[PDB]
Symmetry: D2
Subunit: 452 residues, 4 copies
């Protein structure tokens, strides 16, 4: 298998897209920018319904970290199918869900007392985090960051602050969430270069919470939790300054506020550590995970300080939580990560840094590149001084990559995320970066952007 | 296989239960009333980790309708694992999710045009219903019924009114939900026998909404939706009067209010129709399903009138939605249902009605039996006049059934649900009802309840 | 002065009404049902701008208890205008507000220690009660009754459940209020005659709270307070059964819930006790008063158990609170009340009961008469069996009374309130009841209602 | 009368303070910083209960703009007392309330169609503004400014963002308010000197609303209104840049958002214009007023664009609104303002600017002085570089002014407001500024602050 694309979308792709439009609700599907219609998958490749072969830099939005069709994950699933699929994890007991909980407790950041609540998705895991924090602190308010993405349920829609269309006609959602600027080193209300001056940007974000919220309208004692992504995902693959979470933890600790680390996108080895928060040297009170945990099967986990546990039975539960097929898949995922995929993300890191810095030097349309491990963000701007979003052009780069056999996803208003499966070879990575560079070059030439 | 129980919980079960309490959050597991630790399943039987063999009358809380471990569903999953697992159904397209959406549209109640939003759970399917209703109507309030269960997320916790511990320290959840009494023919605020006088009970509930809410504090024009279970599940397997939903729909239509039918527990053939609402001759605007749809793989679906679609992209989305493995499972489930399992529910309905009415005649501790298809509730009371809940006795009956190789679940404060897989034979069903009756006899004799 | 009416509304009245509609917001003024344009007042009489003279049975919606224009109250105001008007009672101190606070503490129901928060209105007094209850209990939910009126501010609009137009497009107001049926002995969801069977109605309301709210969706421990009117005013002058509040207090005490008695309309001597709750033999935790307290100057007061005080400065405050002119007026009002006006209410109670029961015997259009002291409600119905509201007829009776020189107000959907100033003579009262009866006779004859 | 103070608090003052503490709720009274106990008032002087005479620079928190005891206001009141006090302004009509509404429509900023809703206080007037805006736009969200003060009711507590103690245990209040930094030229999150660079600070506040809120989590189309004070009062007498409201109006107009101008403290001539918004050259959609409007009698008004009017009767109302004593007082207040008090505020302005700039040059403890007309703020800091709040010292300056016969109020964390009645003479103003300078000098010497 190698990238090989003729007509896309082909006739079979166009037929499915038409049928999708007829029977399915309008969500985030784009017939003009995302015309990929997947039929099957092999190693790091998609094969679409017309036989087109595409190199995967999407991981299906950071879910297929261990590969598009991991054989070790599939064996575990088939083995679990011969035993039981659903055991009603929350009314009856089963050993598969308990074996996963024991492993998640062990691999949790830091070395503190942990328990786990299992669910079916990232948004469920964040909803469970909200409930654990409310119950354990008896506090009802939360702080979240502008640009955040935590899910689309009534609780998590209040935490999410990515695109206003996410909230259109939804008000009122869960009350009690206040938002403050993320320490985005490329775009922040202070105009601070947070790469050159990380401490200045850290102090402005901390000062905003302390002076602007705590000293005026948000009683610090009534805040249950601060929710954060350790790198903002949907918001643009935004990597905050290295010392930010240490300063955030000093502020939270002074007021008895929990730190809630959303690893739904950046966890499960994506940054060359089991958790992205590991690069920032703090131990969050709650960690939420989903997506890559189940290696393609729906699963969520909320890993929390043990003493936060619900005092009584029946405060939270679900039907599908502790799903044995999901539990089997996740145990197989974690062993793959620990046996070389995390190390492979650390090894590939400098290839991604070097090539993307080379692309920033050469192509003016690139405002910023940023990343850790195999989580990389490239933001496109009309002008490096105004930083006006190159949204049209970003979309065209994705489309040109597809035509050349590379599957990419946009993030934020004008960025692209590069998130290839952690099984990707050096040679597969170089090929995808070369195709990515060609798509930028094409759209740069087509719009007259400087090429140095 | 036959019901065969020695010590339960056995030594391997006790080890799992202790590990569960150590590593996992406190939810709805009960070491005292539900000490069932499942290792595998075969036909209508659980095999626990100590080799005990139990006849299943739980169906994993109404999820395993097509049997504890269906070969057609397993075959379809294995076939799907060969092609792909996750294709990012909400960014990219794939034919598998579209095939399921088309089928759900076709089997939806009534003959109006529909679309589908796919999710991972019942609570997600109901959160999507909230969002669809708010967007499409531009109204923000909802009516739900006392005793309802719709899920534990911030939006669905406001809809749910089953047990107050479900809300403990969670206020505020999503504002805007008002609750009114369910037309429960055994227990209602008016003292009405809703079996003997159904129209009187219907009329009291309808008049409570019109006279008490609409004419006093709830502007009818601001209500987006009325959420209902067609039989309350977690609330006690409560079957409302046959004409109630017709009268509810007249009131809703008068005010432009949507009807949202929660079929998460009563759907997928349980009541001897594909949808439980089909017994009540209305066409709801929105139908939610989960649990049984995936035959053991987590899935949810929100089926709605096509003109309620989100008019713009990015209002609602999910990661795992349109999961290809769940979709393959769901199409298999629907084929099995349409090709014989629903007919089986229809055939065994009279055996349950006959056996449960005989038990009610013989055992004074039984206050009420009610049901449709293979959905049966039996409610235990201390005295048939007071209808004082026999909560302790109900728990003792579940334990005595389990010791004798029958897995039952409680529902409401003093009821038991009988929900065996729809593949159950007449002989297997008779074996179950016999054990259930032996358990009732034992607990009656212990406490001095009359046996006629 | 005697009732004397020629044209109403006369030419000067019509000019004022037209100017009102041009310059002022649309509220609860009614050019068709309430065309009374007041120029001055003398004793128990309004003199309108065209010189019409009307006997007042309105008391300015229960504000002018001490008479339409009391000389002792006017003397005290004039004396206070000589010294000071506003002294900023919440930053600086003054002896006038303190003298009133001391008096209110002394005349509060029961013999427990109290403190007082002074405000400008009934809605302010009730918003202060919400804040006192939330702070002192650290709980956030409230129970209120269907038919209640507590004010139109964002906190009190959630408590109020009188007419849905009061809430139109205002959602969301303050979250956390659940409503249950009032023990209205004439109209209730159970169809109970609460006059003949008061304990049955009490028991249904108490059981609705315990069984339907506490045992299903409202955690009793999270309820800060139960708000009630001791007689519902705007809801129809509805007198609940004499033992209801005693049973309500048992339920509240069991759960640590405060009792908040809204006396804004029924206090200051109206019912022939200083507080209407004194008829029902309980000591509420919080009492709110306004309207009549100031004898025509805006004032409100929130009287509470001293141990509910805000433990810290700056939680609640106001500008005009402890206004010295209002305080001087209020002390005068309380002296007049204690020195004869409350005795007058006691003396005239039997004349109202006798005359209104005679009217109920004679006029079939009257469904119900109810009252205490000088607080009387008469409810008009199309048919004594259906109790269909005679809303049009009720409005016609108010208009026919006005044409004959009696000012009445509607209450609820088809009732009239009789609330004459407490200085009214037996002769003046008889003149009023005679005009009221003539108005009922006229509207009965017009529509063919039986006259026995 | 001249400032003459011996012992303060004297024995009679100490007795009232003790009694206040016994019978009245803990609010914003300070026995240690505000020991003034007012007995009567004359011209611009308080006389306390021990015969101490103090020059008034407080106006009783901006209420006594026309004087402590205006004779023209008192005559109007006594004249209205001979006619009627309360006419039930919202059920019946009266010419006094209509004459006030007609005058408020006329004096409203700009020349656009207006109507008026009358209430009893600033917080009621702001609550009415929230309801008018919600009803007229059918939008439920609001933007308010950090540092804002709009009242302590459930609606206005959401708008208020001055001290977190104002909200202690009150959550949840009315949902839907988002807060952004005020353009405070002395203290803002960008560290911008807004005196030297007003356009830079304006653009940062506008950009924060547009880029940070509108482009991320606050759909601009769902915002009913932006609430602002034209000078922040309780927050510190903060005067925004001259062009700020023109830029705010361009932003609001682009999205159909209302501008709601809170003049409860800065209106009724205080800044040498009838309204403070007049200095900023925009025409707000809604204007709220109270305090000084009633010249010492409780009153509120909400003046709004006529087409916003409530479409139906019964959405908003009150009992005491249109109170004829209040209406008479307010008509007399407005005539005093228009006949020379507003002009007197313009005349005294440069005396206040010159003396306070002289004090800033001389006393290092002064960080900032700012003001318009007779509204002036002096902010005290420990260090002019850190701007650390000199809260202890601010309180001591107030106390030393009192001992020397000047009544001052603190504002914000370390400011003092100078708000003398608009009837103050040049000679009275110089005397109060000389006493104010002596109090600063004393506390400067006492703490070692530089005196240049
Ligand atoms: C940080 C974060 N949180 C939450 C979610 C939502 O997860 P799901 O879509 O699995 O509900 C996503 C995607 C995400 O990236
Ligand atoms: C009627 C009903 N709705 C919703 C749910 C929640 O579904 P899940 O537990 O899959 O989120 C359940 C269970 C249910 O019975
Ligand atoms: C019982 C009750 N509570 C509250 C209010 C509101 O009082 P106000 O209109 O003075 O704000 C009224 C009138 C009332 O009758
Ligand atoms: C700007 C502003 N709004 C509102 C209020 C509250 O007014 P009141 O205390 O009259 O309710 C004040 C004082 C104020 O200064
Ligand atoms: N993982 C976050 C984004 C995934 C999905 N397309 C959504 O927008 O919900
Ligand atoms: N005018 C605003 C402040 C007035 C009062 N002391 C309060 O804090 O509420």
């Amino acid at each position: 298998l190698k990238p090989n694309v003729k007509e896309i979308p082909g006739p079979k792709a166009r037929k499915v897209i038409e049928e999708h439009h007829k029977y399915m609700a309008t969500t985030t599907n784009d017939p003009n920018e995302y015309f990929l219609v997947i039929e099957r998958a092999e190693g790091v490749y998609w094969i679409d319904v017309d036989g087109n072969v595409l190199l995967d830099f999407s991981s299906g939005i950071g879910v297929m970290n261990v590969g598009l069709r991991n054989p070790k994950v599939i064996e575990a699933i088939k083995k679990q199918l011969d035993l039981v699929l659903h055991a009603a994890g929350t009314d009856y007991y089963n050993p598969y869900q308990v074996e996963l909980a024991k492993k998640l407790v062990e691999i949790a950041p830091g070395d503190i007392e942990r328990k786990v609540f299992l669910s079916n998705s990232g948004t469920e895991a964040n909803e469970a985090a909200l409930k654990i924090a409310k119950w354990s602190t008896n506090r009802k308010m939360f702080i979240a960051f502008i640009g955040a993405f935590h899910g689309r349920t009534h609780g998590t829609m209040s935490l999410t602050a990515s695109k206003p269309v996410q909230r259109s006609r939804m008000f009122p959602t869960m009350p009690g969430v206040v938002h403050v600027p993320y320490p985005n080193p490329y775009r922040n209300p202070w105009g601070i270069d947070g790469y050159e001056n990380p401490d200045e940007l850290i102090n402005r974000v901390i000062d905003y919470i302390e002076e602007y919220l705590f000293e005026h309208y948000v009683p610090a004692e009534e805040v249950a939790g601060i929710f954060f992504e350790p790198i903002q995902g949907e918001g643009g693959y935004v990597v905050p300054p290295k010392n930010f979470f240490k300063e955030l933890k000093k502020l939270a600790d002074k007021h008895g506020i929990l730190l809630i680390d959303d690893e739904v996108q950046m966890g499960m080895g994506r940054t060359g550590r089991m958790w992205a928060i590991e690069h920032f040297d703090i131990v969050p009170d709650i960690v939420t995970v989903a997506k890559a945990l189940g290696g393609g099967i729906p699963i969520g986990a909320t890993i929390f300080r043990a003493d936060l546990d619900f005092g009584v039975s029946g405060v939270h539960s679900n039907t599908f939580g502790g799903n044995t097929v999901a539990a089997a898949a996740a145990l197989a995922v974690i062993e793959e990560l620990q046996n070389g995929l995390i190390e492979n993300a650390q090894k590939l890191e400098p290839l991604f840094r070097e090539r993307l810095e080379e692309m920033k030097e050469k192509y003016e349309i690139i405002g910023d590149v940023r990343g850790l491990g195999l989580a990389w963000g490239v933001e496109f701007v009309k002008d490096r001084k105004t930083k006006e979003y190159a949204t049209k052009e970003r979309g065209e780069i994705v489309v040109e990559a597809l035509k050349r056999g590379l599957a990419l996803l946009g993030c934020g208003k004008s960025a692209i995320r590069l998130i290839p499966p952690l099984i990707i070879s050096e040679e597969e990575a170089k090929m995808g970066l070369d195709i990515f560079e060609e798509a930028i070059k094409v759209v740069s030439e087509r719009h007259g952007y400087k090429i140095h």
